[PDB]
Design a protein around this nucleic acid. Structure first.
Ligand SMILES: [Br-]
Ligand SMILES: [Br-]
Ligand SMILES: [Br-]
Ligand SMILES: [Br-]
Ligand SMILES: [Br-]
Lengths: 300, 135, 236, 49, 213, 242, 267, 295, 223, 48
RNA sequence: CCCCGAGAGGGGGUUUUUUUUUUUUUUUUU
């Protein structure tokens, strides 16, 4: 594929800066990027921005029939297809690459598998008709942190989305339009948030395997340049209920167990601030839509 | 792209109205002397619809071939005969009970629709809308 | 306010005047007409310049296209039989750097440049339908004209316009406002690469952050303040 | 190039104009529409389907 | 469903309904797209078959180097009767072995001869069936190769008798392929004679087609 | 809600083991000499894994060749008969499997000295014949053994282990029944150290219990390392003595 | 083929094999097989299993699993699944062997499917999963020996409920511990090589490379049976063969097969 | 066992100056004076093992010799290889190592030899000399930085192989010696490549002259048109006994081969040598023969 | 015709834009000229990699048609002979349909054409001329020709049209008609009345685009 | 243009309707040197 | 740097899957 050429000078500089408690963007080692959440006109339309990183998620649903195995559960899928828009490093439709499959699996284990969405409440008539919720993530601009950005984009979208109200007459489904009656929100059991840690070995492999004192550097939410020069990755997902949704350190630089535990506790402070942030932006968005609805009726 | 353009232009030119694909389902009962008879309604509960598929094999390509695919599809659609469809009068297969965590539910009885081996009705094409291709 | 031109627009200059065509201007091989193909400001050199007027269009771009007599910053990404494979920009077509394109070259002794090294070089040949070539010496004298390896330091991505202004325009305050804060050496490439190196990393980092922000804002009368807050923030 | 789906009635169901080469003039369009009708009349009545 | 095809709605279910020795037709060279092509139609009793063969080659093979040519044969399902992909692969392998004994591969270094056989229309009118189609495939491929201008040692033909298929060359003196499914016991001699009769008839009609047409 | 005694008041599990006991661990080196440069047959409980290491050797395509290091590839074949219920579809292109293969590669890239084998390729083929919980940990042990058998240089052992958490009771080395009844944590420990190559948590675990679970796993993984090391020295003595 | 040989090596091998007193490179006789090792009943999770190891390192693993099905809707009661390591699932060799093996072990051709019947409505579906770890020639005969061994050491669950679903219609229930051994007669598949006018049983890798042709002959109930297929062991030296060779091959198998079965029938 | 020998087993997947053995990660020494060699790695004073093998101390060079691993080409080795590919002005030949060895066009003897004038068409017609699949003798002329070998055949002793059959044993069973081409009873000649690749052919005039128009046919695929069955049946026998020695992990030498060849004469049919118990006994008889002949 | 556009919003791309018409919002990115894959290489001209992503779900055959029509417009616009054996990646991510995507793709196509053009301008790629695209529709009863129709207007339409013209001379001379995609029932008189009114609104669009381009790019350049 | 309609359909012969055929309509078209073969099959879906 | 040659010549330094003990009055403090 198309490679990103990194000079020895750039490799040595960024690593040496870390040895001097410096990162290029001026952040701290434990500092998460400021997350900006923008909602569109339609429900389920959400735009997440972390520095230069830009992702967009769109929640949609349509009437479908549940699987034979699960007659009481609705359908839910998450799409995260990459495109050259985020950078020429990504091949169009490359859904089998190492980083792609990992990212796809992290999100799936954080939202799908974790049961963040109440799929039981997606059923209209058992074993016949149900809702099929779809989360489409669009990677617009890549500056690292695509996993953390996606997990927030999916969750913010699901919590913002509203499906058309339905009254049931036996098997006859009466789908009320938004013009008739208001749409119905989705059921969220918990709010999973991902925090990704990047590891750097300031020395050599020998001192990592048999070295007495540990000296490996770990930073939170790395940018693209920091992401291309790391030796190991850790993605930990938690919620406000003080529970670990999932942890994934798929190989890479061997890291001390206590250090990995420290990361999990550090991530918990971040996911708390992020979750409350999402909720507040959802309230204000609701207050904004209601205030306009009052100004539209008054003028009507 | 050819598949799409064929699909869209059939929808845009309004060749096939949904009403022309509605299945006028009949009923097959067991008459006297141990025989099966099928009674079809005319000019008048579950409802079915026909779905048309098409396979277009192009051999010996020598240039732009969309126009040939469309004209062939048009000629083919004018020969389409829809098979009569019927259901058994009282098929033994009824609702299927599925249990939840305390509460019970019943999946609706699925009726197996069967096509007639011989009897068929012609496809109702808006012949006024059938266009032919040229480039 | 400037005099903007768009592709397809009529070319102001008359055919009766001999005109040397630069960037942005295209001469159609079929209809022989001269027409603008890029969007930006049209610049026409004054008459009396040896009877030849040079017309070109200054347009915004960040994807470099190799042209002869350009100082560029490349990175060694491969070693062939007789030359180096060097990248001037990510995802772009590779350029070749001959083993004989160095001072004191010989068929017996190859240069000591390894893959991953930065080189400051000059584009010697840039055929449109052929792999471009760079050199790290003066073809006539044989000496090194400041060309060669760039040891350590940090490299910076920058749009072609910002790099061209930094290399050819002396009124650009950036190099001045950085000299007012620290000592530094700088290599400037027309391929949108800027190499910066100081004695201490904190100063190089401060320079990196300033050049990045100044490239982003593109407001000349704000470079001094940006450098002020940057070198200050490092001290904390 | 020009692509047309012409109904024998006289109306048109599809008209694609792609001018990447020579200029597509109204005369070229009108002549194409005429031939598309003539072609359609031939194809529709030929095989008595 | 599929993002590359239009297969319609998923809740839709396919329509299920309730309750001489051989006549041949041969044509060659009607596909301008390729180098050689053939049309073979057979009608007998309660089963008719119309299959089309197409030969693409010799064309480029950008891998290593080979002193001789490389043959590939692929059978495709038609419109009506379908067959298992495994079964079509098996016949393809059986056909590859046959024409690797007939095609003068020495004349085509670093080249590829890709032979396609389309099982276009196979009607079963009886109001492993693949065994009865095999001799017609060999006939089509032989016609197509000869029409393409690919050198052949001899006109390869075949016959079928009670699930046994055997292809002959050299006036039926030798065998280039032997196929047997089901059938009976100790019926080898009878099958060889019956198939050689079909082989002889097919070869005569093939030569008649390659010459007069 | 489990009607079976996952952990009885007598401190006994469904299979008879206690809370801190590993399953039957039997390694086997040089099982396929005519098929690979290195090979290992792993039996950890009912788990049965064939591991083949082919290389370092010439790449089949010069396009895929690194002049600074060897190319490391891992393909896990979870057979359709690995479980009690035969799976109808294949798992070859399953996203779960691609992640496993990727994970294993990312683990040994920082252990196997690929830098001393430039312009070569190391292909690791794995066949899972039978599965019964903790298949990831068994995959790790199989690769480590097979790589050593191939005489391929590496910095240290990598031992894999799984630890379940039944409410408050940690369970070392979980089988399929226990994994279906609780959340498990898979560890990949380097040598005798406290450093983790692989930390894998796929189900919900309280933040307070995670540190203790890690402590159990690391201790258990060290025992796996000892068993692997023991069996390896035994095979070494039986071969070097001839 | 698999093995790569020079023109000189092939010429020497061919002349040696095409000789009237046929000389094999390992000194074997035209009917002698190479020594093999067979392991059985090592997969407790399955109903039956086998593992065969050849002398050239060729290794194949077969697993046997069962499933209760309605034989009124499930036509094929025995499904063979072949997986050759290093090959795609849709490879030509894989699908061909898969198609071939399924014909060899059809329900009403070379297998007593009566022993799979449970009731008047339900029967046992047998899944024969093949895994070829390594192979240097056509593994069809190798797989056949393994499938044979596996099917002769297979144990299926025993039925408890009544066997008349037409009237009483009882749900199929099985005993908790007892299992009945699967009594069945698995067929064998022999592969031959044709070098000149000589026919060799169990062709080696180097032998197959120079062979003019080959034969795949099935064997069941003490007699030759379909599928019988001629096969090109290589693709560079394939030639037509006289009919007497075909009759020689069938005769050769017909007299040496019981010897193979006898050495294979040991429990 | 009249036709086939089938060994069976149930309930099991399979049958189941001191040299210091070390495993990866194990601490070998803590003396910083040592020079660390292959099989090792270090951190300050500590020297660890990277492979499983025996600790080796030569002078001040500490290294760990692995128990297993591919053939490692040393400069000057006599190897037998197969041409894998042909490109530009060189061949790449399969020796049996981590990488293919190279064989430059200028490192071989062109047909017609010293009398031949240089031609620029040779580089475009290399396939007429050595093509894919061809076997040949070669000497490891030089070594590349990674360890790859550059071969040469600039000798009458080296060149394309014919008039025989190929077989291979693990390279560990064949060591370096003064000469690897040997003449054996039965008018056959063995070529014991150090890489484990072995060539057994009919003894040629060169093989006789070694201990006691043709330059145009040094690359011909054609074999000797007159090769007796007695030589062919000798080759088969020599092949089987070599495989037998390899089966018992016995180091192959020219003496061990001839000894086994004559000892195998007990068995009438040559095909009897492929059975396990025969191979094991033949190798065992050789070791015991060297026992009572040595003491 | 109250469209709104932004230029140069993406960092890791040579050029980008965001075009919005009513509810139809499309973001586009352009990287080039760059090194092409072997199968993409054209000996003399530039190779175009054109990708269209839908607002909901994954890319299907529908978007494959959007890619094809968008190709017919962008191909003659770019001076391709300036970049032999080279590649230009053009990606369109439709963020909001602004129409019933199950029935129409009119507004999405026009917005993609305008956005792609703007992204090409931002990227600084040789263009032979300028371009503008508008969606047009004909209503049932009234049979009026509505330029830039709403989603509700499309539902009650008899025909839908995509018109993209090639402009030169300061956006005053129609060089050619790059694309006209007419679908539905219509007669010859309706077609030319459509082309006459369509050309007017297209010319107005170019003028607006020229304004947007100069407003964004001029601050980057020097005087 | 030369065509042949309903030649592949099960309703080809009104007197002898095919039993093992699911083609509702067909058309074989050849124009110049290009050949097009179209066959229409059908399915049924429940409506709600 | 390495290979080759009585004479500073030549060759190379590798490119979605083990989840289901079912029953008759509001609210508050007890
Ligand atoms: Br459910
Ligand atoms: Br950064
Ligand atoms: Br569809
Ligand atoms: Br028998
Ligand atoms: Br090597």
């Amino acid at each position: 594929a198309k490679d990103i050429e990194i000079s020895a000078s750039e490799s040595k500089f960024i690593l040496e800066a870390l040895r001097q408690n410096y990162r290029l963007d001026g952040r701290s080692f434990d500092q998460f990027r400021d997350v900006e959440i923008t909602f569109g006109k339609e429900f389920g339309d959400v735009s997440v921005k972390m520095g230069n990183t830009k992702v967009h998620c769109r929640i949609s649903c349509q009437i479908a029939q549940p699987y034979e195995d699960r007659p009481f559960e609705g359908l839910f899928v998450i799409s995260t297809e990459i495109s050259p828009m985020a950078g020429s490093q990504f091949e169009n439709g490359n859904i089998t690459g190492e980083d792609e499959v990992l990212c796809s699996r992290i999100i799936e284990k954080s939202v799908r598998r974790s049961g963040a969405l109440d799929v039981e409440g997606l059923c209209i008539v058992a074993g016949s008709k149900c809702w099929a919720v779809r989360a489409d993530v669009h990677f617009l601009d890549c500056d690292g942190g695509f996993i953390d950005a996606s997990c927030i984009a999916v969750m913010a979208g699901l919590m913002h989305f509203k499906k058309p109200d339905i009254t049931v007459h036996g098997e006859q489904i009466i789908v009320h339009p938004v013009n008739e009656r208001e749409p119905v929100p989705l059921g969220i059991l918990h709010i999973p948030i991902c925090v990704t840690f990047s590891f750097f070995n300031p020395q050599d492999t020998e001192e990592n395997i048999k070295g007495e004192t540990n000296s490996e550097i770990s930073i939170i939410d790395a940018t693209l340049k920091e992401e291309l020069l790391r030796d190991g990755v850790l993605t930990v997902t938690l919620n406000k209920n003080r529970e670990v949704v999932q942890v994934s350190k798929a190989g890479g630089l061997p890291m001390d167990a206590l250090t990995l535990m420290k990361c999990c506790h550090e991530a918990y402070s971040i996911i708390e601030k992020i979750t409350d942030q999402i909720l507040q932006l959802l309230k204000e968005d609701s207050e904004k839509r209601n205030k306009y609805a009052a100004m539209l009726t008054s003028e009507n | 792209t050819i598949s799409q353009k064929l699909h869209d232009s059939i929808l845009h030119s309004r060749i096939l109205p949904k009403k022309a694909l509605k299945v006028k389902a009949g009923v097959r009962s067991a008459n006297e002397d141990g025989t099966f008879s099928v009674l079809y309604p005319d000019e008048l509960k579950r409802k079915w619809s026909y779905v048309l598929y098409a396979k277009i094999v192009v051999l010996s390509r020598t240039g732009p071939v969309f126009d040939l695919c469309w004209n062939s599809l048009m000629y083919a659609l004018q020969s389409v005969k829809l098979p009569r469809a019927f259901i058994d009068e009282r098929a033994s297969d009824l609702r299927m009970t599925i249990r939840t965590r305390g509460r019970s539910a019943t999946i609706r009885e699925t009726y197996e629709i069967i096509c007639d081996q011989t009897k068929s009705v012609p496809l109702m094409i808006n012949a006024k809308n059938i266009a032919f291709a040229s480039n | 306010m400037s005099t903007f031109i768009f592709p397809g627009d009529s070319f102001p200059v008359d055919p009766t005047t001999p005109v040397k065509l630069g960037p942005g201007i295209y001469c159609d091989p079929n209809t022989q007409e001269i027409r603008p193909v890029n969007t930006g400001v049209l610049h026409v050199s004054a008459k009396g310049k040896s009877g030849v007027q040079t017309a070109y269009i200054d347009y915004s771009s960040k994807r470099y296209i190799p042209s002869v007599n350009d100082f560029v910053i490349g990175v060694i990404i491969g070693t062939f039989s007789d030359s180096y494979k060097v990248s001037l920009q990510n995802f772009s077509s590779s350029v070749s750097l001959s083993y004989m394109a160095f001072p004191n070259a010989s068929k017996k002794n190859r240069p000591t440049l390894q893959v991953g090294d930065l080189v400051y070089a000059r584009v010697c040949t840039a055929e449109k339908e052929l792999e471009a070539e760079i050199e790290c010496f003066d073809s006539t004298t044989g000496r090194d004209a400041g060309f060669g390896i760039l040891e350590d330091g940090m490299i910076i991505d920058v749009n072609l316009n910002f790099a061209r202004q930094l290399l050819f325009n002396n009124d650009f305050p950036l190099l001045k406002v950085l000299a007012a804060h620290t000592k530094f050496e700088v290599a400037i490439g027309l391929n949108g690469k800027i190499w910066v190196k100081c004695e201490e990393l904190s100063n190089t980092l401060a320079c990196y952050r300033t050049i990045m922000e100044c490239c982003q804002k593109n407001d000349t009368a704000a470079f001094k303040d940006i450098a002020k807050r940057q070198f200050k923030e490092i001290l904390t | 190039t020009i692509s047309i789906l012409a109904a024998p009635s006289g109306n048109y169901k599809q008209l694609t104009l792609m001018g990447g080469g020579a200029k597509i003039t109204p005369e070229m369009i009108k002549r194409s529409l005429l031939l598309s009708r003539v072609r359609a009349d031939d194809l529709s009545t030929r095989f008595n389907i | 469903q599929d993002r590359r095809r239009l297969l319609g709605p998923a809740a839709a279910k396919p329509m299920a309904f309730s309750n001489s020795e051989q006549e041949l037709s041969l044509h060659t060279g009607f596909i301008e797209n390729c180098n050689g092509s053939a049309l073979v139609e057979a009608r007998s009793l309660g089963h008719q078959t119309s299959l089309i063969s197409a030969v693409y080659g010799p064309r480029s093979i950008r891998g290593s180097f080979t002193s001789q040519g490389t043959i590939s044969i692929q059978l495709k399902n038609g419109l009506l009767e379908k067959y298992n992909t495994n079964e079509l692969k098996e016949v393809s392998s059986f056909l590859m072995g046959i024409f690797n004994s007939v095609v003068n591969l020495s004349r085509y270094p670093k080249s590829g001869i890709d032979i396609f056989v389309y099982l276009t229309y196979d009607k079963d009118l009886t109001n492993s069936q693949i065994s009865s189609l095999i001799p017609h495939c060999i006939t089509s491929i032989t016609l197509a190769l000869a029409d393409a201008g690919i050198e052949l040692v001899d006109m390869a033909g075949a016959g079928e008798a009670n699930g046994t298929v055997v292809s002959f060359i050299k006036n039926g003196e030798e065998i280039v392929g032997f196929w047997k499914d089901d059938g009976d016991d100790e019926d080898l001699l009878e099958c060889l004679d019956r198939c050689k009769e079909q082989y002889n008839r097919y070869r005569d009609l093939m030569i008649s087609c390659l010459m007069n047409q | 809600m489990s009607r079976l005694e996952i952990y009885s008041p007598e401190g006994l599990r469904l299979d008879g083991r206690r809370w801190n006991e590993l399953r039957r661990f039997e390694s086997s080196i040089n099982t396929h000499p005519h098929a690979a440069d290195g090979s290992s047959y792993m039996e950890q409980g009912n788990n049965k894994i064939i591991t083949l290491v082919k290389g370092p050797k010439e790449p089949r395509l010069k396009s895929q060749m690194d002049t600074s290091k060897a190319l490391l590839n891992v393909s896990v074949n979870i057979t359709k008969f690995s479980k009690f219920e035969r799976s109808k579809s294949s798992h070859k292109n399953e996203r779960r499997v691609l992640e496993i293969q990727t994970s294993l590669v990312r683990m040994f890239e920082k252990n196997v000295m690929l830098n001393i084998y430039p312009r070569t390729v190391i292909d690791i083929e794995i066949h899972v014949l039978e599965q019964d919980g903790g298949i990831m940990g068994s995959l790790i042990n199989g690769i480590t053994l097979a790589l050593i058998d191939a005489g391929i240089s590496m910095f240290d052992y990598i031992s894999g282990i799984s630890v379940g958490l039944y409410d408050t009771t940690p369970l070392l080395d979980t089988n399929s029944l226990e994994e279906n009844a609780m959340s498990t944590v898979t560890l990949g420990v380097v040598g005798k150290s406290e450093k983790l190559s692989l930390l894998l948590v796929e189900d919900k675990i309280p933040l307070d219990r995670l540190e203790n679970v890690l402590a159990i796993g690391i201790a258990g993984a060290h025992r796996v390392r000892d068993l692997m090391d023991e069996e390896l020295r035994k095979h070494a003595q039986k071969r070097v003595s001839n | 083929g698999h093995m790569s040989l020079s023109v000189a090596e092939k010429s020497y091998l061919y002349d040696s094999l095409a000789s009237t007193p046929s000389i094999r490179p390992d000194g074997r006789l035209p009917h002698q097989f190479r020594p093999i090792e067979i392991f059985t009943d090592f997969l407790p999770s399955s109903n039956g299993s086998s593992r065969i190891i050849a002398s050239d390192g060729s290794e194949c693993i077969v697993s046997i699993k069962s499933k209760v099905v309605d034989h009124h809707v499930e036509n094929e009661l025995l499904q063979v699944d072949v997986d050759i390591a290093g090959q795609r699932d849709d490879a030509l060799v894989v699908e061909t062997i898969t198609s071939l093996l399924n014909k060899v072990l059809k329900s009403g051709s070379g297998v007593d499917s009566s022993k799979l019947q449970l009731t008047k409505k339900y029967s046992f579906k047998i899944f024969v999963d093949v895994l070829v770890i390594s192979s240097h020639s056509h593994p069809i005969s190798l797989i056949s020996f393994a499938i044979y061994s596996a099917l002769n050491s297979t144990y299926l669950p025993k039925l408890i409920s009544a066997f008349d679903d037409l009237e009483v219609e009882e749900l199929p229930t099985f005993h908790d511990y007892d299992m009945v051994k699967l009594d069945i007669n698995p067929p064998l598949v022999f592969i031959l090589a044709v070098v000149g006018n000589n026919m060799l049983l169990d062709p080696a890798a180097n032998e197959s490379e120079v062979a003019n042709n080959g034969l795949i002959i099935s064997w069941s109930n003490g007699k030759i049976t379909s599928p019988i297929r001629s096969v090109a062991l290589n693709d560079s030296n394939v030639k037509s063969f006289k009919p007497h060779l075909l009759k020689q091959g069938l005769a050769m198998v017909e007299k040496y097969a019981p010897d193979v079965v006898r050495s294979l029938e040991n429990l | 066992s009249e036709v086939i020998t089938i060994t069976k087993r149930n309930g099991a997947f399979q049958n189941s100056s001191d040299s210091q053995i070390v495993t990866p990660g194990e601490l070998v020494t803590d003396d910083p004076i040592w020079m660390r060699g292959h099989g090792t790695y270090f951190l300050d004073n500590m020297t660890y093992s990277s492979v499983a093998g025996t600790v080796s101390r030569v002078n001040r060079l500490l290294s760990v010799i692995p128990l297993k691993g591919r053939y490692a080409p040393e400069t000057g080795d006599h190897v037998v290889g197969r041409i894998a590919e042909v490109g530009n002005k060189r061949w790449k030949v399969d020796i049996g190592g981590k990488q293919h060895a190279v064989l430059m066009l200028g490192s071989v003897n062109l047909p017609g030899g010293i009398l031949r004038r240089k031609s620029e068409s040779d580089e475009l017609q290399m396939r007429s000399f050595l093509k894919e699949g061809d076997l040949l003798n070669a000497e490891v002329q030089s070594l590349f930085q990674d360890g790859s070998a550059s071969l040469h055949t600039r000798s009458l002793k080296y060149g394309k192989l014919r008039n025989g059959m190929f077989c291979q044993v693990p390279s560990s069973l064949i060591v370096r010696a003064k000469n690897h081409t040997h003449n054996l009873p039965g008018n056959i000649t063995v070529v014991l490549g150090v890489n484990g690749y072995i060539w057994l052919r009919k003894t040629s005039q060169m093989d006789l002259a070694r201990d006691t128009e043709s330059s145009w046919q040094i690359y011909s695929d054609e074999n000797d048109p007159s090769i007796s069955n007695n030589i062919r049946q000798a080759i088969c026998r020599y092949a089987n006994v070599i495989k037998a020695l390899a089966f018992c992990e016995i180091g192959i030498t020219q003496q061990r081969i001839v000894s086994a060849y004559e000892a195998s004469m007990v068995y009438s049919n040559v095909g009897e040598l492929i059975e396990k118990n025969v191979m094991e006994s033949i190798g065992s008889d050789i070791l015991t023969a060297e026992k009572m002949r040595g003491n | 015709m109250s469209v709104q556009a932004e230029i140069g919003i993406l960092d890791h791309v040579d050029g980008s834009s965001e075009f919005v018409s009513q509810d139809t919002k499309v973001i586009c990115s352009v990287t080039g000229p760059i090194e092409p894959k072997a199968r993409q290489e054209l000996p003399t001209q530039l190779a175009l990699e054109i990708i269209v992503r839908p607002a909901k779900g994954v890319a299907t055959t529908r978007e494959k048609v959007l890619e094809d029509k968008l190709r017919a417009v962008l191909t003659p616009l770019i001076t391709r002979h300036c970049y032999p054996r080279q590649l230009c990646q053009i990606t369109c991510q439709i963020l909001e349909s602004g129409e019933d995507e199950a029935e129409f793709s009119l507004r999405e196509l026009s917005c993609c054409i305008n956005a792609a053009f703007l992204a090409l301008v931002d990227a600084g790629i040789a263009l032979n001329s300028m371009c503008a695209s508008i969606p047009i529709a004909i209503i049932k009863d009234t049979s009026d020709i509505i330029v830039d129709p709403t989603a509700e207007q499309l539902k009650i339409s008899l025909s839908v049209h995509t018109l993209a013209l090639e402009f030169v001379n300061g956006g005053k001379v129609v060089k050619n008609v790059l694309l006209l995609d007419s679908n539905g029932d219509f007669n010859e008189d309706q077609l030319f009345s459509l082309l006459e009114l369509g050309e007017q609104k297209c010319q107005e669009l170019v003028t607006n685009i020229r304004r947007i381009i100069q407003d964004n790019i001029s601050p980057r350049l020097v005087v | 243009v030369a065509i042949e309609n309903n030649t592949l359909s099960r309703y080809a012969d009104a007197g002898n309707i095919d039993t093992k055929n699911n083609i509702l309509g067909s058309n074989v078209l050849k124009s110049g040197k290009t050949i097009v073969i179209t066959s229409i099959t059908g399915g049924i879906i429940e409506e709600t």
